[PDB]
């Protein structure tokens, strides 16, 4: 268009984009800043980095970029490259892996009154100190801090477009649920520049994790192997195999704890409850293995070399349960006595196994009352 | 070369920053066409579809028009796209920051101002993965193209037409198309979409969406994951024929099968996305077979407990013995030497009680074997019949009667 | 009309400012560059890649006599902001960067005062090379450095300096990394013990070679080991206790070897996990690695001892003779310390002889059984104390590994922001 | 107005950085090329790539950049943006990625005589062929080939960089003690530099910097060799276990599984090149086959132990060879009712005697395999690591 | 050089690089295109991408860049930045991850006759449809298609420098061996532009894989564990631990299945031979375990509860043992005394019937040992050799 070509030639003829859009240098540029979250691309918990797709809406008045539409065929709005005009230097303070400022530099909208709306896209890879306590039933609060970074509040003051970031076009994450989101404006005095305040806007998102994936992949096998731990108490010592699946379950729990460790960041701020549960389960399995060894040793006690003490016999057999030719005959009598003593030891071992089984089922049903 | 004079004349008083609107309230018609050269991949981990495409963008720029007779009959020129105004058509739903095309080829300019641009692009677009029926799943991915800078009052995005017929599908050129080998394209429709939550001055009011509906070929997964897992989960049931006398090793076999199922769980978790909106079909099967294995380990423990008890440590009630040994095997398929003599008879009396407990355990083993066989077989059949019956919809859009094919 | 436009046009265009010429009146003078570092966030310390990733603000200060104006002549403009691409800046680069990123991430505006004082505070994300001392892992502290140098000019042309600050009218150099409480996030895995800053000069080099001076910012950081303790050390100890407990299993059970073998396998898995989360350097063996090697060797010894006990237990008079000395020692010396027509009658006569052989046979295997129990008890009271003493000693040694009270060996000064040296 | 600005205006009034500085047509520009290594960052054997941090010490002469310092306030030298002057396209042709050029682009130093010096910094990822044999007891020989991408020998003459003093040339990689980070996995034995030409094309010439680096084998000994030695000890111990305890199969098969797991976890550290087999992989395979044969022979021993006269008949040759010859060599020297029950005990005793003979053969065969496996394992392990310790880089680098 | 500076000033004064170098617009730019393969960087089979290091030699005459050497001191060749002159827009059609065209933009050699030689470097990451049938003894045919992308053959026609790509300075891969390589020129009519043909050159490489790494690291353990599956039948059932051996081998093969799955692409065009071998070995182990459970159940069959069928006794005690020759298989005081004799008589009969089941169980073991070892070798030696025969 001839009119728009002439208008753009006239507007930028003596325009210096180094200088702020103020009539007088004592004035400040008022910039309305808004954030539009398009997609939560990823949340790397181990590296503690949240990367999102955003649009950074910025509106401000440039008094040097106004015209009369009557002189230009009625044109009231044009599109200009962002590199041709003065732009705010918004910087993502908590940048972890990427760019501090906008790098795409898309075109902006300019109307005849000098108002400029600029909505550049960005991939914000910001630092989020993730809280690992209630993993994986945990909510994470992560923020983006945006500021002018070179002009104080008396030069390029900014204000939030609305109290909340815009999520009207937000793609559902599937892995996280946006419980809440809000933006707050702050005046900060830094160590660099304590005399004057610098303005920033912090947008925080509180997002709840959907635990189905981690539940299915981690929690269910751990519960299965815990139920497998109590079974060793009901497994008779006479079949062997007690140590076999006892150690098998212990190794499985160790492997799943290793997986959980690989899932979470190495930070020591807090101990995950899933990790505490796995550690306590491993300690319970270790204690069960120790008692299993004791029971096997008691079951295989030699009737001759080892004699049963009186107190253990009394309690474990009374309280808890209620809760040439002359040579062969002598040999058979001695063998009968030895067999009776061996049976006494085996009965004591069986009664320890049943007590431990009753203890484990209590643990289980109390955990059920806990649900 | 007269093309030098022509191009120098055209681009003299020309700047690429001005939309070529002839007058006020003039809307530039921009026509889009997509050619899929190769569906490079569908990364499930990051839910990204990577495709090699040629994007054909056609519009009209009245400034770039000339008279053929005045330039020795030249009617076509190639001008670098960096020197020209472009409608700024971008892929909106990109996983990375890549909005625009990869190459920025030359634009073909005709003497009437017609602008024809056909740049190549490697596009990595977002599409959520429906994991319910993996690996017998079909995905419905889309490529959304918008104008990043102009709204519906300035440009008019449309689908290209050939002979008055609109091209409402993704074009596939037989000369330069490659089969993916894992995904088969069933439907490839295209349509112009609106928001109706935005007015036509918002640059997101209008968009053009190209849909790729693709069905996974499950032969690889069936051979390499499903079949071995089914074989191990069938091996579970062999514990019921092993003895319960500190040999045969029922518990070791069952626990080891459970461990193998855990290994398969880790492999599948490695090969499936972490969406957490649904449990994968093979994941559901793995959870089912692990719970069955856990019950079989418990049943093996119970059988060992019941078959190893003795009258010295356990009392065999006549009720239980009679009930089992009568009801179940019918229903299913089955000086003085007196001191020495009286002690010899003692072993026979004690040994007989052990045999009864052994027979009861075998009765439980046979009864529980059929339940385990029935439970495993139905669960294996039902789960994988669901995937076999997961069919791609007959139409690109389930309500529309149209097929969207050339 | 804005007066800033007129001032900038006078300074840059009217005066013909050249950004490729040092802000110096005569070529023999030197431009002083005051340098400072602010640590906004210690993003990561990858031990496998030996890379420190940090978010910092770089503070440069110098004087440009060309960027000088009389403030009252321009309606009392007291500060100006100019892009770095328009004015001369000193190119201070991070020499020890792992990636090819030498400069700051964002080239923000520069602030110039009417007296020519120019300050630049760009942010940067720096990935620098930090060799890892794995000796006391996970109870270890690391000593990383960021070495900034001027490669566009030599020491005769620009002099690098530490930024100075004034307190009660006295100027002191800022010999430390500045940490702003308003803008700083604790890492959660690393705690900063020392954070000094030094201006280093190399006398063996010449002042005209760009390798004569640098400014180095040091970060001495102690790892917080509670995560690693709970998640790795405790399961290792708990599993090794089972190898200790394998001596209490009777030989009649067919599980004596399986327990020890499984403990060895678990310890090997933990050893491989430790190897994965560490660089492949040969400076030293990690503390956790030494502990795992010692435990795996002791568990292998336990497996061998269990094999010996099983071999002794199943010895029989049909193949092995119970020697007098072995019998006497393992049956009384060690248990004391450990506190443990008419042929029918002739036919009947033959039977009792076979019974007598059986009773004698049962005695010898009974003695071999007691020999095995004694060797089991002896190893139980001689290997378990070593494992407990070895476990406690190694982890006590790591727990007593603290970074030194001073960041430098011969330097008595504490490079703390609370105690400036010159003021 | 500073005099440096005037000098810069005079020097670049008609200077063209795209024109090689040949004062007369046909002249060649001599370019001195040297390398300073500040950090040997990584040697990735998986992709066969060496990444290092270097300074390229480049020197040449540009007759267009001459001036009289007496006429410019005694300015003897200048520092100029590198893009303002002509430079030779000295690039690393050995790069593994697409990066041919330097990274930092520092200012050039131009003296009043026309001598231009340039020391750009770079992170270079060059291609190195890994000799997989002897890994992880190996020295690698990685080359960095530098030459002008465009200009050939008819236009530029490549030379070695001069020393700190101009007395002599340096034919090696320079290491600055104040700015060199020692690599914790490699030790530099030789760092020579040499000019290279090619026959059949008298227009090629490069300067190649050679890094001969010996690997420090720790973190591989303690994490693969020692555990595998322990597993081999267990495999030897398998033949000392009695068959009467059901632990032969568990021990031997678990040892085999552990060795296989170590091999699999080492598969991500060795290169995928199929020119030869690394010595650690050969040792692992030897241990794997040894443990597999241990499993096979333990199965044979268990089969022999449970044999019975009711099941098998002892061959004359087997009884002869084993029972007679082996133990000396291996030190393994050892009213009618009453009538019926006496014979029944007698029948069992002679039957039991033949059972013990099968158990004796198994015990004798077990001891023989115990000594044979110990000798093979000890000699085989020692032999593998005997020549591994003999692999050292040559005294002469050959440049 | 003053002469060269003046020449470069003269050449680029009235030169427009947007416009083709033809005397008349009806003429075409004849460009000689050659490809020099410096190094085969990698062949990612999972992603089906081959990345190579190449030099793209391009030669063409620009009539606007000619000069008389006698007017410039005798200069006959100069070096010019490629950004100053018109360049062909060669595009790699089958680009998978990288640049479609050249991005480095090195200098070019221009002689006084207008001829231009430009040899820019490139890292081509092109799509390679890898054939996974005979992995790892497979040969891959990977191709690179290069075209002009904006001009038909009547404008910027291109021709190959030689019938084969240049591998004179090609460095040996160590993982692949170049069996063959050749370039072909094609005239293609696309659905965009059916009136006129577009010219492309396709350089194809047929590369054989060196299988030493994969053999040693994968195949040999699989062979060892298959042999152990066979061996499990020589283990006596009286010792137990048959299930231990079978299960351990099965777990090892499961782990190797996971490892091999991590190596091959998930495409279903063809079943890999290594995958077929893994499935065969898995079925082999499953069958061995089922037969082992049958044998264990037979060995522990109760004499009183289960009576041996006459037919099975006949066969497995008379016929099968005699068939094979290599094996060592065999081919009140008075009343109290009367009570113990009856007890020992009954126990002797029970023992004889007990060992009969045990004898039959080990006869089946010998039959299955011979069968399983025989099928094992012909399932590997005869089957793997089909590809090795070539
Ligand atoms: C005598 C005293 C000492 C002998 C010393 C020999 C050991 C060292 C060589 C073995 C070795 O290198 O590993 C090799 C195998 O390894 C084996 O051969 C294992 C053999 C098992 C012994 C079986 C005897 C048990 C009873 C008997 C049972 C009845 C593996 O090496 P490679 O990688 O496969 O080689 C190919 C590499 N190349 C392609 C580069 C050529």
Q: What is the DSSP string of D321-389?
A: IIIIIHHHHHT----HHHHHHHHHHHHHHHHHHHHHHHHHHHHHHHHHHHHHHHHHHHHHHHHHHHHHT
Classify residue A268 by its DSSP letter.
-
Residues A265/A270/A273/A277 CA torsion (nearest 10 deg): 90
CB C362 within 8 A of CB C320: no
Is A191 in contact with C180 (Cβ distance < 8 A)? yes
| Residues in Cβ contact with C104 at an 8 Å cutoff, skipping those fewer than 6 apart | C58, C122, C123, C124
Orientation angle between helical segments C234-245 and A242-263, nearest 10 degrees:
170
Q: Residue D77 belongs to a domain with what CATH number? A: 2.70.170.10
Quote the longest CA-to-CA distance of chain E.
144
Q: Which of A151, A150, A189 is nearest to A27 (CA)?
A: A151
Residue D283 near ligand 1, beta carbon < 6 Å: no
Beta strands of chain E (E only): which ranges?
31-44, 49-61, 77-81, 91-92, 107-111, 115-118, 121-127, 139-147, 158-160, 176-188, 198-209
| Residues in Cβ contact with B355 at an 8 Å cutoff, skipping those fewer than 6 apart | none
Q: Which helix (H) or strand (E) holds D55?
A: strand D49-61
Sign for the CA dihedral angle at C356, C362, C364, C370 comes to: negative
CB C149 within 8 A of CB C298: no
* C chain contacts of residue D119, beta-carbon cutoff 8 Å: 151, 210
| Residues in Cβ contact with A68 at an 8 Å cutoff, skipping those fewer than 6 apart | A112
Classify residue C207 by its DSSP letter.
T
Q: Please tell me chain D's helix, strand, coil percentages from 3-state DSSP, rounded to the nearest 5.
A: 40, 25, 40
| Residues in Cβ contact with C28 at an 8 Å cutoff, skipping those fewer than 6 apart | D74
- Alpha-carbon gap, residue B80 to E227, rounded angstroms: 67
E257 touching D (Cβ < 8 Å) = no
Is A221 in contact with B262 (Cβ distance < 8 A)? yes
Distance of CA E178 to the CA centre of its chain: 15
Residue with tokens 């995005």: B157
Q: Can you give the C-alpha Rg of chain A in angstroms?
A: 37
3-state secondary structure of B387: helix
A218 phi/psi in degrees, rounded to 5: -125, -55
Q: Are strands C110-112 and A121-127 parallel, antiparallel or unpaired?
A: unpaired
CB A240 within 8 A of CB A205: no
* D chain contacts of residue E75, beta-carbon cutoff 8 Å: 25
CB E367 within 8 A of CB E230: no
- Alpha-carbon gap, residue D49 to D128, rounded angstroms: 5
> CA angle, B263 as apex, B262 and B264 as ends, to 5°?
90
Q: Which of B227, D299, D260 is nearest to E230 (CA)?
A: D299
Give me the residues of A, 89-128, that contact C with CB < 8 A. 89, 91, 93-97, 99-101, 127
CA of E230 to the centre of ligand 1 (A): 22
CB A95 within 8 A of CB A79: no
D108 phi/psi in degrees, rounded to 5: -85, 150
Tokens describing residue C136: 């006391």
Q: Which atom of ligand 1 is nearest to the CA of D290?
A: 21
Name B187's bridge partners: B213
Q: What totals of helices (H) and strands (E) does chain C contain, helices first?
A: 8, 14
CB B385 within 8 A of CB B133: no
CA distances from A155 to A145, A197, A283, C76 (A): 19, 11, 62, 15
Residue D299 near ligand 1, beta carbon < 6 Å: no
Domain that holds residue B11: 2-219
Query: E195: burial class by Cβ within 10 Å (0-12, 13-18, 19+)?
Result: exposed
What b-and-e string marks burial along C335-367, b requiring 16 or more CB atoms within 10 Å of the CB? Answer: beeeeeeeeeeebbebbeeebeeeeeeeebeeb
CB atoms within 10 A of CB A226: 19
- Alpha-carbon gap, residue A332 to A335, rounded angstroms: 5
- Alpha-carbon gap, residue A227 to E188, rounded angstroms: 68
Residues E234/E238/E241/E247 CA torsion (nearest 10 deg): 60
Give me the residues of C, 361-380, that contact A with CB < 8 A. 366, 369-370, 373
The chains in contact with chain D, meaning 3 or more Cβ pairs closer than 8 Å, are: C, E
Instruction: Report DSSP letters for E158-181, one per residue.
Output: EEESSSS-B-TTPPP-SSEEEEEE
Half-sphere exposure of D44 (CA within 13 A, CB side): 13
Give me the residues of B, 156-175, that contact A with CB < 8 A. none
D194 phi/psi in degrees, rounded to 5: -150, 145
Classify residue A95 by its DSSP letter.
B
Residue D376 near ligand 1, beta carbon < 6 Å: yes
- Alpha-carbon gap, residue C215 to C195, rounded angstroms: 13
Residue D186 near ligand 1, beta carbon < 6 Å: no
Name D42's bridge partners: D51
Q: Please tell me chain A's helix, strand, coil percentages from 3-state DSSP, rounded to the nearest 5.
A: 40, 25, 35
Classify residue B166 by its DSSP letter.
B
Name B144's bridge partners: B209
Is A190 in contact with C258 (Cβ distance < 8 A)? no
Q: Which of C125, C148, C146, C115 is nearest to C35 (CA)?
A: C148
What b-and-e string marks burial along C98-114, b requiring 16 or more CB atoms within 10 Å of the CB? Answer: bebbbbbbbebbbbbbb
- Helix segments in E232-332, DSSP class H: 242-261, 273-299, 310-314, 320-323
Tokens describing residue B234: 């069938």
Among B42, B68, B224, B237, the residue to mutate for chain E (most E Cβ within 10 A)? B224
- Alpha-carbon gap, residue C377 to C384, rounded angstroms: 11
- Alpha-carbon gap, residue A282 to A272, rounded angstroms: 15
Classify residue E338 by its DSSP letter.
H
Residue D374 near ligand 1, beta carbon < 6 Å: no
- Alpha-carbon gap, residue C266 to C232, rounded angstroms: 12
- Alpha-carbon gap, residue D367 to D331, rounded angstroms: 9
CB B106 within 8 A of CB E89: yes
Tokens describing residue D151: 């200009």
- Alpha-carbon gap, residue C56 to C124, rounded angstroms: 5
CB atoms within 10 A of CB E137: 19
- Alpha-carbon gap, residue B250 to E296, rounded angstroms: 12
CB atoms within 10 A of CB A234: 17
Shortest Cα–Cα distance, C259 to chain D (Å)? 10
CB D40 within 8 A of CB D211: yes
- Alpha-carbon gap, residue A248 to A228, rounded angstroms: 10
D198 touching E (Cβ < 8 Å) = no
B238 touching E (Cβ < 8 Å) = yes
- Alpha-carbon gap, residue A115 to A101, rounded angstroms: 22
Name E116's bridge partners: E60, E110
Sign for the CA dihedral angle at E77, E80, E85, E86 comes to: positive
**Ramachandran class of B102: left when φ > 0, alpha when ψ lies in -120 to 50, beta otherwise:** alpha
Half-sphere exposure of B4 (CA within 13 A, CB side): 13
| Residues in Cβ contact with B255 at an 8 Å cutoff, skipping those fewer than 6 apart | A228, A244, A245, A248, A249, B297
Instruction: Report DSSP letters for C265-284, one per residue.
Output: HHHHHHHHHHHHTS----S-
Query: C154: burial class by Cβ within 10 Å (0-12, 13-18, 19+)?
Result: buried
Tokens describing residue E255: 């782990």
- Alpha-carbon gap, residue E390 to E387, rounded angstroms: 5
* C chain contacts of residue A99, beta-carbon cutoff 8 Å: 105-106
Classify residue E307 by its DSSP letter.
P
- Alpha-carbon gap, residue D288 to E223, rounded angstroms: 12
Is E261 in contact with B267 (Cβ distance < 8 A)? yes
Residue D230 near ligand 1, beta carbon < 6 Å: no
CA distances from B279 to B48, B229, B276 (A): 20, 17, 7
Q: Residue E76 belongs to a domain with what CATH number? A: 2.70.170.10
Domain that holds residue D189: 3-215
CB C121 within 8 A of CB C59: yes
Is A79 in contact with B246 (Cβ distance < 8 A)? no
3-state secondary structure of D109: strand
Q: Please tell me chain E's helix, strand, coil percentages from 3-state DSSP, rounded to the nearest 5.
A: 40, 25, 35
Is E293 in contact with B241 (Cβ distance < 8 A)? yes
| Residues in Cβ contact with D125 at an 8 Å cutoff, skipping those fewer than 6 apart | D49, D50, D51, D95, D96, D97, D99
3-state secondary structure of A48: coil
CB E128 within 8 A of CB E49: yes
- Alpha-carbon gap, residue B404 to B170, rounded angstroms: 9
Q: Residue B86 belongs to a domain with what CATH number? A: 2.70.170.10
3-state secondary structure of A127: strand
Domain that holds residue A92: 2-212
Classify residue D390 by its DSSP letter.
T
- Alpha-carbon gap, residue A235 to B304, rounded angstroms: 7
Q: Which helix (H) or strand (E) holds D234?
A: helix D226-237
* Residue of E3, E5, E212 lying closest to D277 (CB–CB): E212
Sign for the CA dihedral angle at D72, D74, D77, D80 comes to: negative
Classify residue A196 by its DSSP letter.
S
B180 phi/psi in degrees, rounded to 5: -70, -40
How were these coordinates obtained? cryo-EM
Beta strands of C186-232 (E only): which ranges?
190-194, 197-201, 213-223
- Alpha-carbon gap, residue C122 to C102, rounded angstroms: 13
Q: Ligand 1: which residue has its CA nearest to atom 17?
A: D286
CB C266 within 8 A of CB A254: yes
- Alpha-carbon gap, residue A238 to A244, rounded angstroms: 13
- Alpha-carbon gap, residue A332 to A325, rounded angstroms: 11
| Residues in Cβ contact with A261 at an 8 Å cutoff, skipping those fewer than 6 apart | A275, C231, C232
3-state secondary structure of D53: strand
> CA angle, E329 as apex, E324 and E331 as ends, to 5°?
80
Three-state secondary structure of D242-291:
CCCCCCHHHHHHHHHHHHHHHHHHHCCCCCCCCCCCCHHHHHHHHHHHHH
- Alpha-carbon gap, residue A40 to A208, rounded angstroms: 13
Nearest chain A alpha carbon to B340: A329
CB D230 within 8 A of CB C300: yes
Residues A169/A170/A171/A173 CA torsion (nearest 10 deg): -170
CA of D380 to the centre of ligand 1 (A): 8
Residues E191/E192/E197/E203 CA torsion (nearest 10 deg): -80
- Alpha-carbon gap, residue D76 to D113, rounded angstroms: 9
Q: Which helix (H) or strand (E) holds B286?
A: helix B281-308
Mark the breaks in chain C: residue after which each occurs, C to N over 2.5 Å: 340
Q: Which helix (H) or strand (E) holds C161?
A: strand C158-162
Distance of CA C199 to the CA centre of its chain: 26
């Amino acid at each position: 268009s001839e009119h728009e070509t002439r208008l753009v030639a006239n507007l930028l003829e003596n325009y210096n984009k180094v200088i702020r859009p103020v009539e007088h240098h004592t004035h400040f540029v008022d910039i309305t800043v808004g954030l539009q979250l398009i997609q939560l691309i990823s949340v790397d918990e181990v590296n503690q980095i949240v990367e999102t797709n955003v649009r950074l809406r910025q509106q401000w008045i440039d008094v040097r970029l106004r015209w009369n539409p009557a002189d230009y065929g009625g044109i009231k709005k044009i599109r200009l490259p962002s590199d041709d005009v003065w732009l705010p230097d918004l910087v993502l303070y908590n940048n972890a892996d990427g760019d501090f400022a906008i790098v795409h530099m898309t075109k902006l909208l300019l109307d005849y009154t000098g108002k400029i709306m600029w909505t550049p896209p960005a991939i914000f890879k910001s630092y989020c100190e993730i809280i690992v306590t209630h993993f994986p039933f945990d909510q994470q609060n992560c923020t983006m801090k945006l500021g002018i970074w070179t002009y104080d509040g008396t030069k390029v003051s900014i204000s939030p477009e609305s109290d909340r970031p815009d999520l009207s076009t937000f793609m559902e994450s599937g892995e996280w649920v946006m419980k809440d989101y809000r933006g707050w404006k702050h005046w900060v005095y830094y160590t660099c520049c304590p005399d004057t305040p610098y303005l920033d806007i912090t947008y925080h998102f509180i997002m709840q994790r959907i635990p189905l994936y981690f539940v299915v992949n981690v929690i269910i096998p751990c519960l299965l192997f815990s139920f497998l731990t109590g079974l060793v108490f009901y497994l008779p010592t006479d079949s062997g195999e007690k140590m076999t699946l006892s150690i098998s379950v212990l190794l499985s729990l160790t492997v799943f704890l290793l997986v959980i460790v690989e899932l979470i960041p190495s930070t020591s701020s807090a101990v995950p409850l899933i990790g505490k549960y796995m550690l306590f389960t491993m300690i319970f399995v270790i204690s069960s293995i120790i008692i299993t060894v004791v029971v096997i040793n008691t079951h295989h006690r030699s009737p001759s070399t080892h004699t049963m003490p009186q107190w253990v016999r009394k309690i474990f057999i009374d309280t808890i349960p209620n809760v040439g030719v002359k040579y062969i005959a002598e040999h058979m009598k001695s063998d009968e006595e030895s067999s009776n003593a061996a049976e006494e030891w085996k009965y004591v071992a069986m009664v320890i196994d049943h007590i431990l089984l009753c203890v484990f089922m209590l643990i289980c049903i109390i955990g059920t009352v806990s649900v | 070369n007269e093309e030098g004079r022509l191009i120098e004349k055209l681009l003299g008083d020309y700047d690429k920053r001005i939309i070529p609107a002839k007058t006020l309230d003039h809307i530039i018609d921009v026509t889009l066409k997509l050619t899929l050269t190769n569906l490079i991949s569908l990364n499930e981990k990051e839910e990204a579809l990577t495709t090699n495409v040629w994007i054909e963008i056609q519009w009209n720029d009245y400034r770039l028009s000339w008279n053929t007779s005045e330039y020795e009959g030249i009617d076509l020129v190639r001008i670098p796209s960096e020197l020209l105004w472009l409608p700024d058509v971008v892929l909106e739903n990109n996983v990375d920051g890549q909005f625009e095309v990869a190459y920025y080829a030359n634009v073909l300019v005709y003497n009437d101002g017609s602008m024809y641009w056909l740049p190549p692009a490697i596009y990595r677009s977002t599409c959520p993965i429906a994991v319910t029926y993996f690996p017998f799943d079909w995905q419905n991915c889309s490529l959304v193209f918008r104008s990043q800078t102009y709204n519906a009052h300035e440009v008019n995005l449309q689908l290209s037409a050939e002979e008055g017929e609109a091209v409402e599908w993704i074009h596939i050129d037989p000369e330069d198309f490659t089969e993916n080998g894992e995904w088969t394209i069933r439907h490839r429709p295209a349509k112009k979409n609106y928001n109706w939550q935005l007015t036509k001055d918002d640059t997101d009011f209008q968009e053009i969406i190209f849909f790729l509906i693709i069905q996974r070929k499950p032969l690889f997964y069936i051979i390499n994951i499903i079949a071995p897992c089914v074989l191990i989960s069938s091996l579970v049931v062999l514990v019921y024929f092993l003895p319960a006398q500190a040999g045969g090793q029922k518990c070791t076999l069952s626990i080891s099968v459970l461990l193998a199922q855990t290994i398969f769980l880790f492999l599948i978790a490695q090969k499936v996305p972490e969406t957490s909106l649904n449990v994968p079909l093979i994941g559901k099967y793995l959870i089912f077979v692990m719970f069955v294995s856990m019950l079989i380990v418990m049943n093996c423990v119970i059988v060992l407990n019941v078959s190893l008890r003795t009258p010295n440590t356990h009392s065999l009630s006549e009720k239980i013995k009679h009930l089992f040994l009568g009801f179940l095997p019918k229903y299913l398929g089955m000086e003085a030497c007196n001191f020495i003599a009286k002690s010899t008879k003692e072993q026979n009396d004690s040994g007989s009680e052990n045999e009864n407990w052994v027979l009861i355990g075998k009765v439980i083993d046979k009864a529980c074997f059929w339940i385990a066989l029935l439970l495993f077989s139905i669960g294996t059949l039902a789960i994988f019949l669901t995937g076999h019956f997961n069919q791609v919809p007959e139409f690109p859009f389930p309500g529309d009667p149209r097929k969207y094919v050339p | 009309v804005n007066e800033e436009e007129r001032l900038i046009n006078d300074l840059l265009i009217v005066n013909k400012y050249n950004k490729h010429v040092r802000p110096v009146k005569h070529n023999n003078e030197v431009v002083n560059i005051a340098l400072s570092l602010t640590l906004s966030n210690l993003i990561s310390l990858k031990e496998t890649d030996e890379t420190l990733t940090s978010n910092v603000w770089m503070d440069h200060a110098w004087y440009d006599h060309r960027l000088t104006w009389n403030a009252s002549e321009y309606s009392d403009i007291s500060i100006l902001r100019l892009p770095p691409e328009l004015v001369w800046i000193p190119d201070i680069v991070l020499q020890n960067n792992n990636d090819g990123q030498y400069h700051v991430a964002y080239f923000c505006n520069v602030l110039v005062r009417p007296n020519g004082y120019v300050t630049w505070l760009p942010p940067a994300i720096f990935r620098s090379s930090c060799p890892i001392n794995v000796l006391y892992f996970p109870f270890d502290w690391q000593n990383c450095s960021l070495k900034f140098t001027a490669l566009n000019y030599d020491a005769n042309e620009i002099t690098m300096d530490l930024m100075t600050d004034t307190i009660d009218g006295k100027d002191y150099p800022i010999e430390w990394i500045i940490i702003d409480p308003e803008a700083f996030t604790e890492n959660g895995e690393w705690e900063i013990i020392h954070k000094p800053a030094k201006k280093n000069i190399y006398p063996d080099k010449f002042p005209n070679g760009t390798n004569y001076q640098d400014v180095t910012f040091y970060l001495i950081i102690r790892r917080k080991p509670l995560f690693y303790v709970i998640n790795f050390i405790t399961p290792c100890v708990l599993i090794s206790f089972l190898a200790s407990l394998a001596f209490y299993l009777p030989a009649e059970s067919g599980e004596k070897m399986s327990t020890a073998i499984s403990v060895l396998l678990a310890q090997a898995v933990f050893l491989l996990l430790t190897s994965q989360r560490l660089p492949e350097t040969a400076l030293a063996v990690p503390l956790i690695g030494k502990y795992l090697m010692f435990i795996m060797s002791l568990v292998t010894g336990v497996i061998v001892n269990c094999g010996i006990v099983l071999n002794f237990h199943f010895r029989t008079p049909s193949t092995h003779v119970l020697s007098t000395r072995v019998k006497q020692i393992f049956l009384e010396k060690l248990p004391r310390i450990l506190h443990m027509i008419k042929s029918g009658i002739d036919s009947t006569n033959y039977i009792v002889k076979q019974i007598k052989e059986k009773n004698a046979y049962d005695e010898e295997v009974g003695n071999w059984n007691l020999v095995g129990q004694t060797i089991d008890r002896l190893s139980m009271f001689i290997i378990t104390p070593v494992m407990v003493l070895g476990t406690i000693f190694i982890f006590v040694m790591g727990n007593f590994n603290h970074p030194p009270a001073k960041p430098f060996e011969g330097d008595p000064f504490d490079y703390s922001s609370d105690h400036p040296r010159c003021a | 107005s500073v005099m440096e600005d005037t000098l810069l205006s005079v020097l670049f009034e008609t200077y063209n950085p795209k024109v090689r500085p040949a004062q007369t047509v046909g002249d060649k520009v001599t370019v001195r090329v040297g390398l300073t290594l500040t950090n040997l960052l990584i040697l990735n054997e998986k992709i066969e790539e060496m990444t290092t941090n270097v300074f390229l010490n480049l020197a040449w002469t540009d007759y267009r950049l001459q001036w009289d310092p007496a006429a410019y306030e005694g300015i003897k030298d200048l520092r100029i943006p590198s893009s303002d002057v002509w430079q030779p396209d000295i690039v690393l042709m050995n790069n593994n990625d697409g990066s041919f050029e330097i990274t930092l682009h520092v200012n050039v130093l131009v003296q009043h005589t026309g001598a231009v010096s340039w020391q750009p910094s770079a992170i270079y990822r060059s291609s190195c062929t890994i000799k997989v044999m002897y890994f992880p007891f190996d020295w690698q020989n990685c080359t960095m080939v530098f030459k002008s991408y465009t200009y050939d020998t008819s236009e530029v003459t490549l030379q070695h960089a001069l020393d700190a003093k101009g007395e002599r040339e340096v034919k090696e990689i320079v290491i600055n003690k104040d700015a060199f980070t020692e690599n914790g996995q490699w030790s530099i034995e030789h760092k020579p530099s040499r000019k290279n030409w090619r026959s059949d094309d008298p227009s090629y010439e490069d300067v190649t910097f050679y890094l001969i680096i010996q690997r420090k084998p720790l973190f591989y000994i303690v994490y693969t060799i020692i555990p595998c030695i322990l597993i081999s000890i267990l495999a030897i111990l398998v033949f000392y276990l009695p068959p009467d305890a059901g632990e032969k199969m568990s021990l031997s098969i678990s040892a085999l599984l552990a060795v296989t797991v170590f091999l699999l976890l080492l598969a991500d550290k060795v290169p995928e090149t199929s020119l030869s087999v690394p010595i650690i992989i050969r040792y692992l395979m030897f241990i794997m086959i040894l443990v597999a044969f241990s499993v096979i022979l333990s199965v044979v021993v268990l089969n022999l132990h449970h044999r019975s006269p009711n099941t098998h008949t002892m061959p004359n040759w087997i009884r002869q060879i084993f029972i007679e010859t082996l133990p000396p060599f291996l030190w393994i020297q050892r009213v009618e009712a009453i009538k019926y029950i006496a014979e029944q005990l007698e029948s069992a005793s002679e039957f039991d005697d033949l059972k013990k003979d099968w158990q004796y053969v198994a015990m004798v065969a077990d001891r023989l395999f115990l000594y044979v496996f110990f000798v093979i394992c000890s000699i085989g392990t020692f032999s593998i690591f005997l020549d591994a310790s003999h692999n050292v880089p040559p005294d002469n680098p050959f440049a």
